[PDB]
């Protein structure tokens, strides 16, 4: 095309671009110049690469640098009629499509760096093509918008001992187990759906800025942790054996409904509490759990065995809405980024390793697939508020609180040969469960 | 053949994952796919005995702090990892070890202390003395050069064998 006063015209070679060999070519690695050339290629559209590049590029190119490179790509120096029609026009359009996708789907780059947006608006003001007026206007409309800030009838809310409005009596045994599961599933589905790819790519939730870069993810994990700890505390603070057995049974019924809702985060919240050192050792309590409820917990725990083999199969087999367990994605993203080189070298030259970026984008893409579909369930504001405000640790630090739970376990069921004390009841109301069959 | 269930534990960012990946990878292949079994299961020969190592590395899930008991309960022996440039990760080790003993309901759990290689803030002598006070081996590694990686996992396998005998 052009001579080499346009860096993107340098011929492909093994030392600037590598393709995957296992429709559109898939780039395994390239110089950033070749990546941006193929991102805005003249011979074909590549929407998948546009999506994965704009999701992952900040690990190998700063936002200001990317804008400079795409403006350089657009400003092509000049049969010349053929060149304009077959090279300049299609590349320029492709560039504008990348700009539009960038401001539409990754506007946080501009929110964090106001000068990046100034440069973008200045660049768009230079594009005069009569053809490109529609792209110009479309991009301006999105920018102006960004700068400004039940499918079916839901079933009846279920109630047990606590009556509507009596917030102050809400507790694990007094709310209805169906409704505890429903309201935790709505809360956990909302927390899951709020996590954005910018909180994940680059493993930024593991780095020193994690609280500013991954707030929604961390809020979600802290809810899961607090619910697991609340289940543990409810169990070990119930000193009387029959009452405790009723508490463990009720948590397993909540687990049964989590499974019916495909809320795997809730399933794991229960499984983790039952695996915890203060709970797992309670021989006398588990002995009294009905066999049919043992079976429910047994099948849930088995989802985690063998590196989550049965979990992964079950998730692939159900239909949304669902709430995935996020921790698997986190380990896979982290290991994908740490286990593959940042750059490949070829006859002395460095190429950006884009395949590991693509692999991370495939994970964030699966996360996003499960975020589309909401639950057809009605919120109950007081119950939602009760769970949003759970704080089982109180004022204690992690170590002090988990030592408290374990000492409570040793008090309520002492180690052999020490004798098993009897303990007074604490629950004034009936322990019988209403079950987990809904009304109508 | 004998299978060993190993669990890697430690603070965020100390190189748990790099150690595991460097163990599993064939030496000159730099392409890791964590979604398949061969990424965490490896057949090796140690002191003449051939075995299968199954390594549970949950790096990236450190914020799920109430799931540690569940993960630790799956294991036979533990690699307790800290970063030699990160003093807090070394101070955390005591808490991981106490949590493991509680989960395993045992005072002698097969375990190896690993200090993985900014500059050094934890003295070799301090880590050796801590390991000695626990009755366990200490091994320094550099996941990046692969130095000490096999020694760390094989030493843990040896500890598991000594415990079963």
């Amino acid at each position: 095309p052009s001579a080499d006063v346009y860096r993107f015209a340098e011929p492909d070679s093994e030392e600037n671009i590598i393709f995957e060999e296992n429709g559109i070519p898939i780039i395994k690695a390239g110089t950033v110049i070749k990546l941006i050339e193929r991102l805005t290629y003249h011979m074909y559209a590549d929407p998948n690469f546009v999506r994965t590049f704009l999701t992952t590029y900040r690990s190998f190119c700063k936002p200001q640098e990317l804008l400079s490179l795409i403006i350089e790509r657009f400003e092509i120096p000049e049969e010349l009629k053929r060149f304009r029609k077959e090279y300049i026009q299609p590349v320029q359009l492709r560039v504008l499509n990348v700009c539009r996708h960038w401001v539409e789907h990754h506007f946080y780059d501009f929110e964090r760096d106001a000068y990046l947006l100034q440069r973008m608006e200045e660049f768009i003001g230079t594009v005069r093509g009569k053809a490109m007026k529609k792209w110009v206007e479309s991009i301006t409309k999105i920018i102006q918008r960004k700068k400004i800030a039940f499918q079916s009838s839901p079933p009846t809310v279920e109630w047990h001992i606590s009556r509507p409005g009596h917030i102050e009596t809400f507790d694990l045994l007094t709310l209805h187990p169906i409704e505890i599961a429903r309201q935790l599933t709505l809360l956990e589905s909302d927390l899951y759906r709020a996590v954005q790819p910018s909180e994940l790519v680059g493993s930024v939730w593991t780095k020193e800025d994690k609280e500013i870069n991954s707030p929604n993810l961390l809020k979600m994990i802290r809810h899961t942790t607090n619910l697991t700890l609340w289940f543990e505390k409810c169990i070990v603070e119930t000193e009387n054996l029959e009452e405790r057995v009723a508490v463990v049974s009720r948590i397993i019924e909540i687990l049964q409904v989590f499974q019916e809702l495909n809320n795997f985060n809730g399933v794991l919240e229960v499984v983790s509490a039952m695996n915890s050192s203060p709970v797992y050792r309670l021989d006398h309590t588990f002995e009294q759990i009905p066999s049919r409820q043992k079976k429910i917990l047994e099948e849930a725990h088995e989802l985690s065995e063998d590196h989550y083999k049965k979990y992964l199969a079950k998730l692939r087999s159900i239909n949304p809405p669902c709430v995935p367990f996020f921790g698997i994605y986190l380990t896979n993203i982290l290991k994908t980024e740490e286990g593959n080189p940042e750059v490949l070298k070829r006859h002395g030259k460095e190429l950006i390793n884009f395949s590991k970026r693509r692999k991370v984008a495939e994970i964030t893409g699966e996360i996003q697939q499960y975020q589309n579909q909401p639950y057809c369930l009605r919120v109950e504001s007081d119950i939602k508020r009760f769970f949003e405000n759970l704080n089982p640790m109180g004022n204690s630090m992690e170590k002090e609180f988990t030592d408290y739970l374990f000492n409570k376990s040793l008090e309520i069921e002492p180690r052999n040969p020490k004798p098993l004390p009897r303990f007074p009841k604490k629950y004034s109301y009936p322990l019988k469960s209403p079950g987990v069959r809904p009304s109508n | 053949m004998t299978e060993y269930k190993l669990v890697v534990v430690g603070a965020v960012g100390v190189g748990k994952s790099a150690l595991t990946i460097q163990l599993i990878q064939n030496h000159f292949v730099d392409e890791y796919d964590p979604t398949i079994e061969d990424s965490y299961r490896k057949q090796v020969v140690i002191d003449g005995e051939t075995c299968l190592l199954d390594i549970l590395d949950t790096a990236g899930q450190e914020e799920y702090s109430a799931m540690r008991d569940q993960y630790m309960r799956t294991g036979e022996g533990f690699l307790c990892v800290f970063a030699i440039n990160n003093t807090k990760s070394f101070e955390d080790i005591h808490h991981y070890r106490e949590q493991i003993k509680r989960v395993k309901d045992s005072e002698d759990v097969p375990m190896v202390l690993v200090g993985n290689k900014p500059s050094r803030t934890v003295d070799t002598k301090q880590a050796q003395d801590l390991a000695r006070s626990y009755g366990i081996p200490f091994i320094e590694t550099s996941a990046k050069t692969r130095q000490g990686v096999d020694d760390a996992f094989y030493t843990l396998v040896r500890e598991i064998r000594k415990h079963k005998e």
Partner: nanobody
Amino acid sequence: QVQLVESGGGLVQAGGSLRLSCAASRSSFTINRMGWYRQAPGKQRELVADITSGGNRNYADSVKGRFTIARDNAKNTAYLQMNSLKPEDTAVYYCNAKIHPWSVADLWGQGTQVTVSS
């Protein structure tokens, strides 16, 4: 894929003693509960004795005072000391393991004949 390997058993005079032994083959952590069940001709299989990793035990009423169960947690082995055997103790005896406190799935040994002659 844990397997339970039984040993002991066989023929013994009434009034005498036998020790049954059970060893789990391939396990990564302490089996929560190990025990023995038996099945006499014409009868259902019934619990004889079991013991948790925390040392809590159950004995069938018909063997209390005569049979003792013991285990070695670290080794996932257990044994059953059967004293003052009676012809009614003749049965196939099975080692049993429940992996977790919520386990309902059974791991069973192959079964060991015990025949008490009078």
